[PDB]
Amino acid sequence: MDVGKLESFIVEKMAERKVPGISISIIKDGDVVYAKGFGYRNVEARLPSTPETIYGIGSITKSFTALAIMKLVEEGGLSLDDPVEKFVNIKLRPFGEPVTVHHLLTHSSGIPSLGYAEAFIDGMVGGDNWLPVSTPEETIAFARDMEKWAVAKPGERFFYLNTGYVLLGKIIEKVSGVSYEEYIKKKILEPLGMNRSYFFKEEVEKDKDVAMGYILDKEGRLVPQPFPYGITADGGLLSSVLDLAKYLKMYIERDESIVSKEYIEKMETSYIKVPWEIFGGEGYGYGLIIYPNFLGEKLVGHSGSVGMYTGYIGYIPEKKIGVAVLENSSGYPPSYIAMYALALLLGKNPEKELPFIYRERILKKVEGRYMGYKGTIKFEVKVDGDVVYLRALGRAFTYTIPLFPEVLEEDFIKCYTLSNGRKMYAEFYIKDNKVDLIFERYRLIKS
Amino acid sequence: MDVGKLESFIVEKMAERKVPGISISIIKDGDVVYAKGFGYRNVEARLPSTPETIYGIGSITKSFTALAIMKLVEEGGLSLDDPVEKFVNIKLRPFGEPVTVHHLLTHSSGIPSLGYAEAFIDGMVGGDNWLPVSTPEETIAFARDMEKWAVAKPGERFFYLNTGYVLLGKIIEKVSGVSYEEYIKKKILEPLGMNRSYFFKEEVEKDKDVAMGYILDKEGRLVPQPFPYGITADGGLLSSVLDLAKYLKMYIERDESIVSKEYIEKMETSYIKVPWEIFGGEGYGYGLIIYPNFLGEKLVGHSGSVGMYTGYIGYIPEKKIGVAVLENSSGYPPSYIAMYALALLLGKNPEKELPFIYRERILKKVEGRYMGYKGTIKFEVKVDGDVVYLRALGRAFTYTIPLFPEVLEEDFIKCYTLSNGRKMYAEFYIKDNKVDLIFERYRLIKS
Amino acid sequence: MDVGKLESFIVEKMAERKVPGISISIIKDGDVVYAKGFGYRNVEARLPSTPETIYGIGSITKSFTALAIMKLVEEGGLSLDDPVEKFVNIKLRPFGEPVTVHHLLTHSSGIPSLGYAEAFIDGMVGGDNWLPVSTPEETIAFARDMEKWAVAKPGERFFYLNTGYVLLGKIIEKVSGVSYEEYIKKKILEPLGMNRSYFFKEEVEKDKDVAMGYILDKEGRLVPQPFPYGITADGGLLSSVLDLAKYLKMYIERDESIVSKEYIEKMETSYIKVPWEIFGGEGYGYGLIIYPNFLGEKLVGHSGSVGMYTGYIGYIPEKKIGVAVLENSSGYPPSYIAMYALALLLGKNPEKELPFIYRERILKKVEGRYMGYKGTIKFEVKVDGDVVYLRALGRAFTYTIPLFPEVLEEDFIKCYTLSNGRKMYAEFYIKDNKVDLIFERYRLIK
Ligand SMILES: C[C@@H](O)CN1CCN(CC(=O)O)CCN(CC(=O)O)CCN(CC(=O)O)CC1
Numbered sequence A, B: 001m002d003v004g005k006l007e008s009f010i011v012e013k014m015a016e017r018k019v020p021g022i023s024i025s026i027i028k029d030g031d032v033v034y035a036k037g038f039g040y041r042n043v044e045a046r047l048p049s050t051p052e053t054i055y056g057i058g059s060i061t062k063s064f065t066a067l068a069i070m071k072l073v074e075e076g077g078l079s080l081d082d083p084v085e086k087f088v089n090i091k092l093r094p095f096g097e098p099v100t101v102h103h104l105l106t107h108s109s110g111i112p113s114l115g116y117a118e119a120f121i122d123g124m125v126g127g128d129n130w131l132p133v134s135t136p137e138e139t140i141a142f143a144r145d146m147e148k149w150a151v152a153k154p155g156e157r158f159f160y161l162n163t164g165y166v167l168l169g170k171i172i173e174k175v176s177g178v179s180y181e182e183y184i185k186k187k188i189l190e191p192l193g194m195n196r197s198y199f200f201k202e203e204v205e206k207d208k209d210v211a212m213g214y215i216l217d218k219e220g221r222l223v224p225q226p227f228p229y230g231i232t233a234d235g236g237l238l239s240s241v242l243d244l245a246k247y248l249k250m251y252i253e254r255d256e257s258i259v260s261k262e263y264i265e266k267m268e269t270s271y272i273k274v275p276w277e278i279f280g281g282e283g284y285g286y287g288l289i290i291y292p293n294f295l296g297e298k299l300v301g302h303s304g305s306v307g308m309y310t311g312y313i314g315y316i317p318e319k320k321i322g323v324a325v326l327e328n329s330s331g332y333p334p335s336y337i338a339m340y341a342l343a344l345l346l347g348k349n350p351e352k353e354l355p356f357i358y359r360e361r362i363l364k365k366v367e368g369r370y371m372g373y374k375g376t377i378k379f380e381v382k383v384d385g386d387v388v389y390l391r392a393l394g395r396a397f398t399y400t401i402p403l404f405p406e407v408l409e410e411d412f413i414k415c416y417t418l419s420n421g422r423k424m425y426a427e428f429y430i431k432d433n434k435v436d437l438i439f440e441r442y443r444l445i446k447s
Numbered sequence C: 001m002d003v004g005k006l007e008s009f010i011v012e013k014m015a016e017r018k019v020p021g022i023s024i025s026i027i028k029d030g031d032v033v034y035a036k037g038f039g040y041r042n043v044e045a046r047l048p049s050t051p052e053t054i055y056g057i058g059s060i061t062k063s064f065t066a067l068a069i070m071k072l073v074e075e076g077g078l079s080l081d082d083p084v085e086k087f088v089n090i091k092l093r094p095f096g097e098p099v100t101v102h103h104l105l106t107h108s109s110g111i112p113s114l115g116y117a118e119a120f121i122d123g124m125v126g127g128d129n130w131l132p133v134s135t136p137e138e139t140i141a142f143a144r145d146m147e148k149w150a151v152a153k154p155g156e157r158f159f160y161l162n163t164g165y166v167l168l169g170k171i172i173e174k175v176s177g178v179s180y181e182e183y184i185k186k187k188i189l190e191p192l193g194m195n196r197s198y199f200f201k202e203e204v205e206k207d208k209d210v211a212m213g214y215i216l217d218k219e220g221r222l223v224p225q226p227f228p229y230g231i232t233a234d235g236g237l238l239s240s241v242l243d244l245a246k247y248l249k250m251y252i253e254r255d256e257s258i259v260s261k262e263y264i265e266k267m268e269t270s271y272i273k274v275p276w277e278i279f280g281g282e283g284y285g286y287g288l289i290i291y292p293n294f295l296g297e298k299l300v301g302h303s304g305s306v307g308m309y310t311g312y313i314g315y316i317p318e319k320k321i322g323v324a325v326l327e328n329s330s331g332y333p334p335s336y337i338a339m340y341a342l343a344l345l346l347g348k349n350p351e352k353e354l355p356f357i358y359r360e361r362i363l364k365k366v367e368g369r370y371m372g373y374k375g376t377i378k379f380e381v382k383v384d385g386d387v388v389y390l391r392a393l394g395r396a397f398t399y400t401i402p403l404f405p406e407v408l409e410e411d412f413i414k415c416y417t418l419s420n421g422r423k424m425y426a427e428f429y430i431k432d433n434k435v436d437l438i439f440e441r442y443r444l445i446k
């Protein structure tokens, strides 16, 4: 693998955005072949991020919840077709149709997101909202009426729902007899030798290699924020890239120490399509996203985010390779770093084969100030994600147009905007460090 | 025609958009059957707008310039295929091809807008721009190197160019032997009885029924702005809807007072398609815009704008009907009012036939604040013209998503945004004073 | 009891008012049948509120001071009709008539509030005023001219006076011979087994489950503020809902391990009416508020607030049920939560029988943007407590009008502002995500 290219990419992005620290581990053929730390785990104390640094892993915790569910099913404790009402005291039969365990694992209950995690975490970092659900029990209470929020029968649509996995946590406690955190620690963490993976504040703050979370304010300052303890089965586990390596190894080598291979495969089966089509055909299994078209391979993985911490794990069983990335802020998507490394491992050029990388580079070239014939009319071009904003300069006048890219090339971009029902086009021609923009009746040259 | 309906429309829009005054005239098979003024021609003085109120007509002046060319051509003064260099001393042979009179009239020289008029007027109204071309001579001097601005060969592409008509004005002088203003006055205005159509401020000062222009500032306060004297052949004429009534009559009835009917038809011929598709397949003639599919009819017209004054004239030769509208601000498109009236005259409901009208009504219903489950997350939806903007409420954080309407119905709007290079939908379900928004994983409900 | 309805209520209210954490206990027939903590004890450290969590209880402390006085009276230490001057070195003979122990207990000395507590706490939280009374002895010195502050003869009117209970704390010291803190701990807390109820910071610092106080600033931010140590007899006690359930049990069952039942009945007697009339007839006993018409029952209770902490305790002797709620901010009246629960324990619907509950839900339907015929004029309706404000939009102008709701139903509300000496009426009609407003000559639609 081209380590030089990967490391530059990481440092480049960390500077570009204001990311404090990042840790990464890479598995190949059964062994961890690469594990490094970048930046700081704590800016205030000047503590570096290391391969052993502990970060919140967010929704990566979902796959653990699903694995625990698989084990309980295999031991005959319950059935994937069992209605959730059989295990939890809550109304879950929208339109008369029973939402089952399977529906919850696949976010196909028919109930859109309750926005509970969004409201909760925003408040815990100084935002405007507030949702003090200190325990999953209080979350369930708040969700007493989630049934009335349904907009589709169970099994028809996909709606990423955090509350859904919170209910699965409760289902694990009902069936097993112990607390969710207990079950995960004794049936998964210990048997896998993951000793630096925790749920409790008491054990984390005692560790010596833990990352402090960070949020960038509107002013560009990195503000420290501790983990938002309270979340559990949907995304409350804290861990390191080295511990996630042992976890990924189990899946890749189809190790049957937790469940039989038949069950690991149930988790990797795409059951429903998701709205985030990146490489084409993306779907969802049990607590894992499925990318059947990732550079010629079927990719399996999931992202995580608790606001001041983000992460991503991913593996490709047919190639025996996996990657884990943890970050102490949300400046740059961990999945992108992970996919960059995976692309290099497969022998593909990430700068060319990854849409979100390829698109971002070209669009950045188009940004700047634009002038018409001999400087008559002036314009401003700024990119905000997938969109290109064209704003005519003037303290007192002009408009603003959002442009959608229809064609992206190293030296040419064609976008359209919406004017009177049909699309109006704008073309960007990129050459000798110069950019010609053609829009409607105008011609504008960069600068 | 259902007048009560038309009048309500106009008063309602003038209020909604803060338009100070409007005048309109309607012609039906030979006579002016409706001429009426609305609002104020001068707000500070409390002077009302009347059928005789004088306004700047902007680009409607282009047709006058084109008509004068037709006359000179019918007289053997010049040919439409002659290269411009034959009459004006300036280089106009981009890529080795001669720009002809025909190219100038159809905006097909291959030279995109120089943006001169935008710069000029912006500076004359207090903008941060500045281009003091107080005469067409000065403008031609500035456009000296416009041949190098060319991006296409003559006749292949449409680019609305004001300087193109400034050149036609100079061609009229060279050939006719008199000034552009005198030729237009002597060969068109006078023989058509348009005695209150001027070019010179000295004439305008004498007139007793003249409208002051207005521009709305960043604070929604109407600011008076006088006409920007200096522009001529491309948009410097000032007239009334009654004078334009006599003008439209000539075209409709194919009156040969100035030129043979064969030449009027040359002007109504679609030579090149334009990017202003409203009803489908619109094109450009000579100083006139062609709409081959306007409510099952062929519409001919042209808008005009000098910033503080706007206008429009259009006619349907086959139905012998025409309409003229003048406004002393840029608040509401005069063409929309003119088309509203035309629809009524055609026996059609403008509320169901004109896109720019129902599309505006339907979109308003989606604006407001939306709330997630039990008020967890908040969003505000705002419509700017034809785009729907979805913004998340929070002072610390706040992302805005541009939504483009795809399916538009009375009770359902489906929009899309871009992400990862693919479109992602947002559905708006409108029902009994409330709207349900379904975007990605979320469900948001309005009031 | 319908617990789900109660827990959904609390979470929703905490979200709505930005309350950090709440703890509550419910006692029935001598057993703690329910006790839970919601939200956060300490936001910054992310520690959950629990039934054990300790909070300042504020003026709930007053009932302890009253109980202490009852014991001393029963033991012959003093008389309820004794002038307070007989125990404290201060002038208290407004209008030539001595303020008695009884007068202080009922807030009827004839002396209006000195605003000492308001000034004290305000300054201790970074506010504008300042009154550095670090000890109750200091407050008394400050209160040296209080006699001159009187406006009525003792026993005629009610004026909640915190200094009143400060003087009582000193009286307790004079009679017993020990300090107020020691007297309460040895005579009340210890015999009742209330082992996690404190006065001193040295003790609270050693407790592992304690909440941080919070105050919401003007940007809507929760600002941490530690307990303002210094106050004592009028409201310096810190405790938890589990210890308070033990306290409530004594009154409910009329346990006589501290005083005889005749003295508990003295404390629960309505001696004078209060202006805080919620259900009708509310009065004040001895460090206790009396509600004679609470859902067809006689409720006894008292609230408390120290600024960054609030709480409430209430019990209904006849139904052997009591409730305690503590909060680490003043976002939502803890008495409202307590009464919500008592209503459920009574087989009643709080959503339809508690005024402060439905009135707030209904007045909420009215908030919004209103416009006249085809958008000619714009107005804004915003609710603030009980008053509905109607403002004419438009930057240059934008006057305001206060509207006092006279009639209030599910889909209708009649209010009145004040004109030229007479009441001008406004009516709101609510029907299907729509509200019509008739105000004088105008008709406005939201
Ligand atoms: C968890 C899976 O059971 C879900 N299932 C995955 C595929 N199953 C095969 C299988 O059951 O492993 C296909 C046949 N399945 C028959 C049946 O199971 O009753 C009907 C559809 N099921 C509905 C259901 O679950 O009941 C949808 C998804």
Ligand SMILES: C[C@@H](O)CN1CCN(CC(=O)O)CCN(CC(=O)O)CCN(CC(=O)O)CC1
Pocket: C080, C081, C102
């Ligand atoms: C049992 C009685 O003591 C009750 N008492 C009967 C009337 N008393 C006159 C009297 O008691 O001879 C007059 C008013 N009394 C002041 C006073 O006693 O001088 C105030 C309130 N009293 C309680 C108290 O005195 O603590 C309540 C009613």
Ligand SMILES: [Lu+3]
Pocket: none
């Ligand atoms: Lu490089």
Ligand SMILES: [Lu+3]
Pocket: none
């Ligand atoms: Lu099945």
Ligand SMILES: [Lu+3]
Pocket: none
């Ligand atoms: Lu030809």
Ligand SMILES: [Lu+3]
Pocket: none
């Ligand atoms: Lu002739």
Ligand SMILES: [Lu+3]
Pocket: none
């Ligand atoms: Lu008495």
Ligand SMILES: [Lu+3]
Pocket: none
């Ligand atoms: Lu005894």
